[PDB]
Structure formats: C-alpha cells, structure tokens
C-alpha cells in the first residue's frame, strides 16, 4: 500500500542553562529508525531499527553532520525569530520542523510536505505545489520574503521529489519483514459491573500495526458515539499499538450492543457481539 | 570579491604559515579548499555564521582553521612540511548553503621546501626578432626566456615605454623542467610579444621583459654565499632596430 | 576523459559522472591562475537548463551530466568541474576536464626563424610561428634541447592571431633546421637561410 517517511526536528532554547537543545527523529510510516540528541554522549546519528544497521559508516558520518548543521541553523533562527516577535532573551522558546515525502503502492511519488512551527503554533509551511509558501502571521512574511528571494522552495522540492523517495524505497526493501507487513488487531471484550442497574463494557484492540484503526459501538445497529469513552491510540513499546473503547450498559442488555473494529490488516471489518 | 592574502608564500620547513581570507560582506559561509593537481579540488573545512559544520578534510595534525568574526577567516599550519604545498582557496556563499553560488578567491599558492638552499632567482634574457620574419610576415616577434628558477613562482609581464602591454603577449601556461629527472630540478619559462615591423623599426621604442620571482624574505635566513634568492624582479631590455 | 580540443566557434560538450544521490548539480570552471567560478546550477527535478551560451543536461538515472557551449571563444579555455550536492551541506567536486579552444588561422604561414640575444650574440633561439591549429608540437627531449608548447597571441588591434613555439639548447650540434623535426611540421614550412 501507501508509505511515507517523516522527520521531526525540535530545538528548545535554554536561556542561562546553556545552548539550545536539539532532538531529531525519523520514521517509516510508524516505525522510528534514526535518533539524534544534542545533549547525548555519542553526538551521532544512532540506529533505532534493525534494518538501518546495515548502512555503512559513510551513511552515519554524513547524516550526523547534516543534522548537526540544522541545530546550528536553528540556533540562529531562535535569535532571528526572537527579534521578529520583540521577545526577551530570558524566555525559553521552541522551534519544531516537520517534513517528509509520500509514495504509493508502485513506489512513485505522491506528495511532499514541509512545515515549520514556533512555540506550538504554525509559523510557515510549504504548499502542496512545492512552489509557494504559506505564511501564518505578520512575522511569517519576513521569513517568506527571505525564503522566496533565496529560491528555498526550489531547493526543498528537489529533495522531496528526488533523494527523499529514493531512500524511502531503499528503506522499505531493506525492511520488508517489518515495514510492509500488517499485524491485524487481536480483539477481545470485557465486562465490568458499575452498579446493580448498569455495567461497563470495553472493546479491546491489541498488538496491531499500523496505528490507523476505527473502534465503534452500536446499539442494535445504531452508533453510540455520544455515550462512548474513546481513548487515544497508544504504543505498546514493541512496535505494535493498542486501543480500547468503553460503553455503559443496562445490567441485562449486554448482547444488544456490538463493537466494530476497522483496520487494514483485517480483510473485513470485524464485529464483536456479547 | 573574495580576498586572500598572501598571493604567494615560500617558506622553509618547520615555520608557521598563517593564511588570511576576507569573504564578501554579508555572506554567512566560508569554505577552505586546497588543490595539488590541476584536476579535482580537495575540501578542508566549512563554517556557517562563524560556527564550524564540516572539517572532515582537514589534516588531523598541525592544521587549524579559525573564523574570529563574520568578516575574516584564517588557516594555520603550525609546523610547515613539504607535503603541505598546494594552492589554498577560500570561498563564500550566502545563506550558508552548498546548493547556491560559490564565490572563490584568487587563492594562496604555498610552497614549503625541505632544503631552502635550492632557491634560485631566474635569469631573464630578451631575444630580438629575426630579419627573416620582418621580411616574410612583416611582423616582429620578441622572445623572452626566464632560465633557472626554483620554485615555480613567477609572474612575467611585457612593458613598452613604461606601460604594460597585453596585445601580442602570450606567456607559456606551465613552466618547464630543465632536468626533468631530478625532483629538485630548476625550472624555466617562455613568452612572446609580437608587434608590427614598423613599431620595432623605431629606435625610440623600448621593450622590457619583466619577471617577478617570489622567494625568500627577511625572516627566511641565509647562511651561504650565493647572495640570497629574495623576492625580487629580474628584467632584460631591448631597443628598436631600424 | 582528461582533455578536450575544439576549434573556435564550434560547440563543445563536456561530460562527468557522480556517485551520490543528489538534489542539485553545478558546473564550475577554473581559468589557469584564478579561482573557480560558477557557470550554471541545475536541480535534480530538472532535465535541461540554459544560460546565455551555456546549455546543461542532467540524467538522474545514469548519474551523469553534460555541458554544451555554443560559439566557443578563446576565453572559454579553462578546466571544467562539476559539483554535486547531495543535500544542503554536502558537496563533491569532480575530476575536471581541460578544454583548449584552438584559434582560427585563416592565413597559415609556417616558418622557423632564429633570434639573437640582445645582450650578446652568443645565445640564440628558434621560433616556430604562424602555423595553424592542426599542427601539434612534440617534446624531443634530447638531453639538452628544450621545446615549449604552443601559445596563441592575439594582435587585437590588427585583428591577427598566430600560434608560436620556442626551442633552445646550450651546446653545438643544434640548429633551427633540426630542432623542430618533421614530426610533425607542414611540408611548406618556411626555413630561412641565415
């Protein structure tokens, strides 16, 4: 099916505590494979997936220098942005950068995207045409003017349409065993008495990959999304994910309710009934 | 553009050589390259906003590169060795990216010599045009030979009546080896100046071949009796013949 | 894969290859004596791009590029490098190729003259001049004879260009008739009688 590779950059300034802290991670559709921390002892790009280990020392050495430069690049960006918003040097601010490229079942290019944020709000983003920038506020025009004059959009588009998909396809082939396989959700249902007049019914989805999944309760075919406790999908730590959904039931109306699980690893949407 | 000093530097083994580079004001990156063969360059180090980014090409020892401020950059070889001789190039790009236009300096030509007694200033001689040429093609080609210099740090210029000329002047691109077998062979160079036969026939016209030799300096000390191969200029003149 | 020779006006195509997956490729030339200068930049998402007399092509699949110069001049004689930047921080330079633009000689007049030193008549040199671009000069290396390479002068005001080369030795058994041996001089090379 479809696949993607995304990188997440985080630069947090430490006024007085020292120099800005920089962290970088990269993923393959849900699976992290690289790591970098400016405060770590190694000061190197480290492996986080088994299939990236085979890359030679040349790959690690240059990728370390690539990401190290970005930390320096962000360091001056903290000072530059602090000027745009007329902020004081003692405040701690953060710069977050999100970029990646999307491929298809045939491996051909689908979409590229690059987004930058300042203090949890959108700052500037590359539009889907890979030729123009979207500025969020007044200070974002200033970066937009500088980036337009520097032909930054042309430089970024070359990576997304080019080297990004070239290495994305290389990673998938190297990790066919783990990245291209889907684990269907292992489902089960549980019963909790909340009182003598009512009870709690929870529908579980365990050990599935990828993260996209849909859990819904139905009362005789009628969705109960209003009286439903939904929890955010969570990682199990072994590369799989979890999700459970609860509903409050009358003490004798358990079998009237059904749970519907939708996941790409399952050929057909599973229906679970008491 | 990009300014590099010194243009040339010949020094004995064991001294300290400091290279100076002034990048174009406003540029946020400085690059250092050295070049041993006329073919591909060699990368040394790279800064952005006075902060180093990549120095994988710098030699592990004796080599140190600094950028004291946004407007200047220095490269230091602490113990000069004959294996460090090359042309060192300084380049600057704006926004610090290597996906942009790189503006290079004129470069610094550094030659480090083991035996400093091999340095010799050139011998400049001017040869007068043949009467056969004046009768056959009605032109006059003067020939200049700079014989016997080491190392290959020369700059030849043709002067008539106190003004340098470039029309008809063609200096050879690379020098020759007088004894090509030897490693410390002393070099040679040639150049030509073609003028009209009527101009050569005027006895009021002056022709001078001017060769500039970069060699020793004041610190470079000399304990021999062959004068001193200092940074000098050697010339030879020839007047017009009716 | 080291040097190219092309006459004036003709078009020149130079080729190079790179190994890393790149996002932008650039062409640089370095005139003998000065620093390298940028010619043109072509991005990986582009196939051809042109500026003035410079036309460049990029093949991502074959990892190679070509630069085409239309209406070449003597000023275009230099060494041409191609620089491949895989990211915004990495940049690798190629081996480089020597381009030599031969001048257009409309009126060849091969001749081997002899010149006398202006300080004293003891020393003498031989000058091979006014031959066309086809002729190539050979280094005989007879243990005392020295022969220089060809070098084009431009009498810009008079609109005249000519190739020239120099030979000299410091012994007897040396004459201008044999210094430039017949390998390879034109048959009609003018040999004066001193």
């Amino acid at each position: 099916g479809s696949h993607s590779m995304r990188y997440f950059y985080t630069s947090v300034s430490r006024p007085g505590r020292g120099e800005p802290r920089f962290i970088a991670v990269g993923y393959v559709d849900d699976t992290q494979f690289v790591r970098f921390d400016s405060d770590a002892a190694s000061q190197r790009m480290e492996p986080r997936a088994p299939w990236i280990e085979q890359e030679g020392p040349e790959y690690w050495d240059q990728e370390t220098r690539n990401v190290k430069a970005q930390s320096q690049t962000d360091r001056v960006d903290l000072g530059t942005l602090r000027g745009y918003y007329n902020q004081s040097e003692d405040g701690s601010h953060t710069i977050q950068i999100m970029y990646g490229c999307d491929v298809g079942p045939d491996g051909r290019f689908l979409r590229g995207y690059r987004q930058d944020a300042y203090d949890g709000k959108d700052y500037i983003a590359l539009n889907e045409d890979l030729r123009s920038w979207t500025a969020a506020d007044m200070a974002a025009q200033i970066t937009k003017r500088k980036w337009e004059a520097a032909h930054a959009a042309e430089q970024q588009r070359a990576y997304l349409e080019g080297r990004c998909v070239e290495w994305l396809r290389r990673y998938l082939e190297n990790g066919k065993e783990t990245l291209q396989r889907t684990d269907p959700p292992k489902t089960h249902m549980t019963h909790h008495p909340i009182s003598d007049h009512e009870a709690t019914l929870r529908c579980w989805a365990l050990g599935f990959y990828p993260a996209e999944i849909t859990l819904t309760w139905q009362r005789d075919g009628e969705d109960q999304t209003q009286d439903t406790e939904l929890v955010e999908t969570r990682p199990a730590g072994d590369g799989t994910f979890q999700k459970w959904v609860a509903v409050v039931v009358p003490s004798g109306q358990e079998q009237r309710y059904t749970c519907h699980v939708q996941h790409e690893g399952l050929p057909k949407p599973l229906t679970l009934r008491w | 553009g990009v300014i590099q000093t010194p243009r040339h530097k010949v020094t004995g083994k064991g001294q300290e050589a400091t290279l100076w580079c002034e990048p174009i004001s406003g540029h946020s990156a400085v690059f250092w390259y050295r070049q041993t063969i006329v073919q591909g360059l060699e990368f040394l180090t790279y800064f952005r906003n006075q902060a180093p980014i990549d120095d994988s090409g710098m030699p592990k020892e004796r080599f140190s590169a600094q950028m004291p401020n946004q407007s200047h950059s220095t490269l230091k070889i602490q113990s000069t060795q004959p294996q460090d001789s090359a042309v060192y190039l300084c380049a600057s790009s704006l926004e610090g990216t290597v996906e942009e236009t790189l503006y290079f300096g004129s470069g610094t030509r550094l030659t480090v010599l083991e035996d400093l007694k091999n340095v010799f200033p050139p011998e400049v001689a001017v040869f007068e045009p043949s009467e056969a040429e004046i009768s056959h093609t009605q032109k006059a080609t003067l020939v200049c030979l700079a014989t016997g210099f080491y190392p290959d740090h020369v700059e030849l210029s043709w002067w008539v009546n106190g003004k340098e000329v470039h029309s008809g002047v063609c200096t050879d691109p690379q020098p020759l080896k007088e004894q090509p077998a030897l490693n410390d062979s002393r070099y040679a160079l040639s150049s030509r100046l073609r003028v009209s036969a009527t101009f050569w026939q005027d006895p009021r016209n002056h022709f001078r071949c001017q060769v500039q030799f970069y060699g020793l300096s004041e610190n470079d000390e000399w304990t021999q009796d062959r004068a001193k191969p200092v940074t000098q200029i050697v010339s030879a003149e020839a007047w017009g013949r009716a | 894969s080291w040097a190219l020779s092309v006459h004036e006006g003709e078009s020149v195509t130079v080729n190079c290859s790179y190994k890393t997956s790149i996002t932008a490729l650039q062409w640089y030339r370095q005139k003998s004596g000065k620093g390298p200068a940028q010619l043109i930049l072509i991005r990986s998402n582009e196939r051809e791009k042109r500026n003035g007399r410079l036309r460049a092509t990029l093949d991502t699949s074959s990892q190679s590029s070509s630069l085409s110069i239309t209406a070449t001049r003597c000023e275009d004689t230099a060494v041409y490098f191609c620089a491949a930047s895989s990211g915004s921080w990495q940049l690798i330079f190629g081996s480089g190729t020597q381009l030599t633009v031969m001048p257009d000689i409309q009126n060849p007049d091969p001749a081997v003259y002899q010149l006398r030193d202006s300080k004293s008549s003891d020393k003498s040199v031989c000058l091979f001049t006014d031959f066309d671009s086809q002729t190539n000069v050979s280094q005989s290396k007879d243990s005392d004879v020295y022969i220089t390479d060809k070098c084009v002068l431009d009498m810009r005001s008079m609109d005249f260009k000519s190739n020239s080369a120099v030979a000299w030795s410091n012994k007897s058994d040396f004459a201008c008739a044999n210094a430039f041996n017949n390998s390879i001089i034109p048959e009609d090379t003018f040999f004066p009688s001193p």
Partner: peptide, 9 residues
C-alpha cells in the same frame, strides 16, 4: 535520509 533545507529563516 535528511533533506531539511536551512536558509536561516
């Protein structure tokens, strides 16, 4: 791999 273009903002 890595393709963040750094142009100083």
């Amino acid at each position: 791999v890595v393709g963040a273009v750094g142009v100083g903002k």
